[PDB]
Write a protein that binds this ligand. Structure first.
Ligand SMILES: [Mg+2]
Ligand SMILES: [Zn+2]
Ligand SMILES: [Zn+2]
Lengths: 142, 189, 97, 62, 123, 118, 289
């Protein structure tokens, strides 16, 4: 199923341009669960603007309760897999760090290949994530 | 690079042995698989060349090329390791095939079990797959801490089979992109 | 003698490595893209190790539904019958003029 | 020496279109306009006709 | 010369300050100071090209000659007032800067097999 | 010595017969060869349409500027900076970066291969 | 899984300038045909000469190189055997199965200087003749200089030497389709559209003189200069013109240089691509059953 689901809003872009042949550090924050997104995504193939609405999910598998693992590299279509989203990524978690000073200071470091993503928030929501886990990044702009 | 010469007309002297006592001693103390440590500096001797250094830079700095599974399995033949799983399943609604990542292509040279961390370039290599990169080029050439010396300290048995596949694959990758100096490069405007 | 050689790998089940002699890039690029059109070929690629010699190496890693030997005739005949359809289409168009 | 029969890169035969090039260069035509009348569209087969020394008229005196 | 009425002399041309092997090189000031000195008296002296037009009276060792010599596309002012097209040796070639499989590494040149058989660079 | 079909071919039909390394440019420090290759290309290619207003002097101490070559090469169908989109010879696909091309003037030296074997 | 079905459409067809389309196929069918048509299809060319007397100005080895580049015709080009395939006849003569003879003979006795031509080579077989304007000049003889030789021409593959290839320029392009965003065209003024039209190197984008609209005329001559996209990129309208190449629908501009016909070039190419892919599957058939 879904381990974490939220609706964010684009705050600021770090390059803040168009057709820069690079990746944009799209900073986002929640409004109902007090989260913070730092996902890198290129604007050329997936256009994002300052101020929008998009849902984000994070599941350990895409078989929809049919298999507890991913499987091979090239996964064929089998038994109506979860394809309702538009932006699907894959990556492995590598670092879980905490911080003092505030209650919502537990960050989350994940790498979807060569990109990076920071998830700073309270430790109650990201408590279900272990170390060296194979996660997914389901996203859909609405 | 040990010869310190280019291909603009330099010659090479060749001495041939005849005795067995001069033949067994050549592949024991003199040959390239034995003097892999440059004892003048205390580090690696055979670093990256001119094309391989630029290709290993561009692969990890460009970050905005998504090659599909058609031109990925062709580059998996020059490397002795298998293919990683695709980090991108669907980057766009107008895209169907799972496209790979440029930094995921550089993980076909590090063996499973390689641990390497460089703090000045923020690159972390965990279980034979690099995961981070932010504006660095010092961990590739002859510096203080680089992946060639960390591979020579890891196993020291197949480093000459690693730098060879780090050239015969990076050349075929750079042929697909093309490096050319045009007039707009001198104009800089 | 023995222009095509069959070498079967051991570490990967249902895997082969085909090689021919005295060829060039005209076959390694027309067989790889034909194998990529099929749905039972997970790995297809040509490699020229030494350009001074004349020998290409094709590696085919298929699934358990078919052998990696039976997935070669279906990629050769798919071009051998496509060239006939191209010739039958060009011979009428050159006869129209 | 003489004009080569084929182009060094393309392969188009240009050995015969040398007398009719000097015959059109005898008029008031430009060197950039005397090649358009011989049906040469690429700059590979035009540098042979534009830049070539005629050494045989200096070598035939003796 | 047209704007200031203070001058009493003038040079004929600014290109007439170099030697005959250096004032015919195109863009002689754009190059490096140790890269036109490496060509004006080090490459033109050993470049094959034109030779003596009478090879029946001159008998000397190492008398090489190109088959198809070619004047360059450009026409410098030091090669127009001289009325001589013998000081330009070598042929033209459509070059292209490209990393070609690492075979042109460390100041090397990869060439064409189907161009050296049609008359280019044959001597 | 590569064969003709393996070189990166262009749309018009030209084939590069000499391919040099681009790494030798910021170390030998020789500019003006890319200017010679852009001035010899604009005077050899035909104008679509003016075969009199073009500059072909290339005087050593009276060099024409970049704004005169990049506006003379633009009036014939090629790009301003001299580079053009090339394809692949082995695979056949397009390249992500253009390749500069131009008819330079190369000389052959005396020092051959058979005169140095010993 | 199975085969494809390519569709063609010939635009114009004359001698050595055949132009045809090639739709519904990938690039490895338009490249692996060009690489065969430019170097693999065999013609005939002069290989071995035999100079009896040479009193001209040029050397006796400069003429043997020039005589081999003459574009001889070849109608029985695929029906003949090679020199190594024909073990008989020991070379040196008109075998009429693997070789043909030529006889050049000329002498200048008049006052004016006469030059020999490619129309002076008389062969014993009138089916292999040099094509023909003036013709290919070889030498120029003074008063008292003669030239007489004997040439032997044979069928050869154009991969060995560059004299057997009958294709000078055979290329293909992707034939892209361009689209204009009509919702953002009215943002720019008239002078911006004029400056955007004049920024193109080739005549790709025109203008309607009754409504001032950017109308696409002749889209097959874009040549991928990438000067129209970068012009609107550094302006007040990014992403105005999006240009992407098609994966199919290529066009072929072949040339046959007068040796063979342009129609017989792409026929002998696909008649040899059917036998190059023939000895591979029969030599790998005994390891399957
Ligand atoms: Mg040297
Ligand atoms: Zn040409
Ligand atoms: Zn015979």
């Amino acid at each position: 199923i879904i381990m974490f689901e939220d609706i964010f809003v684009v705050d600021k872009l770090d390059p803040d341009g168009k057709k820069f042949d690079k990746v944009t550090r799209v900073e986002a924050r929640s409004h109902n669960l007090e989260m913070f997104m730092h996902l890198d995504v290129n604007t050329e193939v997936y256009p994002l603007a300052v101020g929008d609405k998009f849902t984000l999910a994070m599941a350990p598998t895409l078989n929809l309760d049919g298999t507890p693992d991913t499987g091979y590299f090239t996964p064929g279509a089998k038994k109506t897999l979860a394809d309702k989203y538009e932006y699907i990524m894959h990556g492995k978690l590598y670092k879980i760090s905490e911080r003092d000073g505030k209650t919502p200071k537990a960050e989350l470091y994940v790498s979807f290949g060569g990109l990076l993503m920071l998830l700073q928030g309270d430790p109650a929501h990201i408590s279900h994530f272990e170390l060296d886990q194979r996660l997914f990044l389901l996203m859909r702009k609405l | 690079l040990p010869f310190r010469g280019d291909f603009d007309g330099d010659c090479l002297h060749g001495y041939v042995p005849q005795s067995i006592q001069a033949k067994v001693e050549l592949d024991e103390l003199v040959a390239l698989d034995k003097q892999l440590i440059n004892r003048q500096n205390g580090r690696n001797l055979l670093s990256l060349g001119q094309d391989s250094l630029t290709a290993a830079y561009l692969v990890n700095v460009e970050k905005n090329c998504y090659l599909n599974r058609a031109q990925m399995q062709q580059l998996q033949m020059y490397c002795p390791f298998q293919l990683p799983p695709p980090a991108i399943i669907k980057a766009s609604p107008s895209s169907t095939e799972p496209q790979w990542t440029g930094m995921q292509l550089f993980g076909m040279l590090f063996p499973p079990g390689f641990d390497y961390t460089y703090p000045l370039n923020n690159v972390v290599v965990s279980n034979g797959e690099l995961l981070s990169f932010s504006e660095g080029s010092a961990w590739l050439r002859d510096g203080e801490g680089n992946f060639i010396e960390r591979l020579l300290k890891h196993d020291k048995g197949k480093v000459l089979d690693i730098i060879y596949s780090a050239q015969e694959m990076l050349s075929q990758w750079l042929l697909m992109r093309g490096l050319s100096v045009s007039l707009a490069d001198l104009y800089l405007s | 003698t023995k222009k095509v050689s069959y070498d079967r790998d051991t570490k990967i089940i249902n895997a082969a490595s085909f090689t021919v002699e005295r060829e060039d890039h005209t076959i390694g690029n027309i067989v790889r893209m034909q194998l990529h059109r099929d749905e039972n070929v997970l790995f297809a690629g040509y490699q020229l190790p030494h350009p001074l010699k004349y020998k290409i190496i094709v590696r085919i890693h298929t699934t358990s539904q078919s052998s990696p030997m039976q997935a070669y005739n279906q990629a050769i005949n798919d071009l051998d019958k496509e060239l006939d359809y191209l010739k039958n289409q060009f011979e009428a168009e050159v006869a129209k003029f | 020496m003489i004009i080569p029969v084929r182009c060094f890169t393309c392969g188009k035969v240009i050995g015969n279109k040398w007398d009719q090039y000097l015959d059109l260069l005898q008029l008031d035509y430009t060197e950039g306009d005397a090649l358009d009348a011989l049906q040469l569209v690429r700059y590979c087969c035009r540098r042979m006709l534009m830049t070539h020394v005629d050494l045989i008229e200096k070598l035939l005196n003796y | 010369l047209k704007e200031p009425k203070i001058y009493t002399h003038c040079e004929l041309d600014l290109s007439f300050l170099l030697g005959v092997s250096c004032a015919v090189v195109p863009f002689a000031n754009h190059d490096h100071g140790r890269r036109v000195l490496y060509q004006s008296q080090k490459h033109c002296q050993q470049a094959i090209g034109f030779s003596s037009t009478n090879p029946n009276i001159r008998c000397d060792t190492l008398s090489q000659q190109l088959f198809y010599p070619q004047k360059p596309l450009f026409k410098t002012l030091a090669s127009e007032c001289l009325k001589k097209e013998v000081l330009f040796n070598g042929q033209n070639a459509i070059v292209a800067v490209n990393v070609h499989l690492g075979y042109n590494q460390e100041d090397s040149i990869v060439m064409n097999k189907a161009s050296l058989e049609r008359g280019m660079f044959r001597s | 010595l590569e064969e003709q079909q393996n070189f990166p071919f262009t749309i018009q039909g030209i084939v590069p017969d000499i391919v040099i390394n681009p790494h030798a440019f910021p170390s030998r420090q020789t500019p003006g060869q890319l200017l010679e290759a852009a001035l010899s290309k604009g005077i050899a290619c035909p104008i679509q349409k003016a075969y009199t207003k073009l500059t072909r002097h290339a005087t050593p101490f009276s060099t024409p500027g970049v704004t005169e070559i990049t506006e003379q090469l633009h009036r014939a169908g090629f790009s301003r900076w001299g580079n053009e989109r090339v394809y692949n010879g082995r695979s056949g696909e397009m390249m992500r970066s253009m390749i500069f091309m131009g008819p330079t003037f190369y000389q052959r030296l005396v020092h051959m291969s058979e005169d140095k074997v010993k | 899984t199975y085969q494809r079905f390519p569709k063609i459409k010939i635009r114009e067809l004359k001698d050595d300038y055949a132009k045809f389309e090639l739709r519904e196929t990938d690039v490895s069918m338009a490249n692996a045909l060009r690489r065969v048509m430019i170097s693999e299809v065999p013609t005939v060319a002069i290989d071995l000469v035999e100079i009896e007397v040479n009193s001209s100005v040029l050397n006796d080895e400069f003429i043997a190189h020039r005589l081999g580049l003459i574009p001889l015709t070849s109608e029985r080009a695929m029906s003949m055997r090679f020199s190594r395939d024909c073990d008989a006849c020991d070379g040196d003569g008109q075998c009429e199965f693997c070789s043909v003879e030529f006889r050049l003979s000329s002498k200048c006795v008049t006052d004016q200087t006469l030059d020999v031509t490619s129309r002076d080579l008389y062969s014993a077989d009138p089916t292999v003749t040099p094509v023909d304007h003036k013709g290919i000049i070889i030498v120029k003889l003074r008063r008292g200089q003669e030239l007489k030789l004997r040439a032997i021409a044979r069928k050869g593959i154009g991969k060995d030497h560059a004299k057997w290839s009958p294709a000078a320029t055979v290329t293909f392009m992707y034939e892209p389709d361009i689209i204009i965003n009509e919702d953002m065209m009215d943002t720019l003024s008239d002078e911006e559209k004029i400056d955007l039209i004049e920024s193109s190197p080739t005549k790709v984008f025109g203008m309607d003189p009754v409504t001032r609209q950017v109308v696409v005329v002749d889209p097959e001559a874009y040549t991928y200069d990438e000067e129209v996209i970068k012009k609107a990129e550094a302006m007040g309208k990014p992403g105005l013109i999006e240009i992407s190449p098609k994966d199919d629908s290529f066009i072929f501009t072949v040339e046959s240089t007068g040796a063979v016909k342009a129609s017989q070039l792409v026929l002998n190419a696909i008649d040899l691509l059917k036998q190059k892919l023939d000895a591979v599957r029969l030599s790998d058939d005994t390891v399957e059953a």
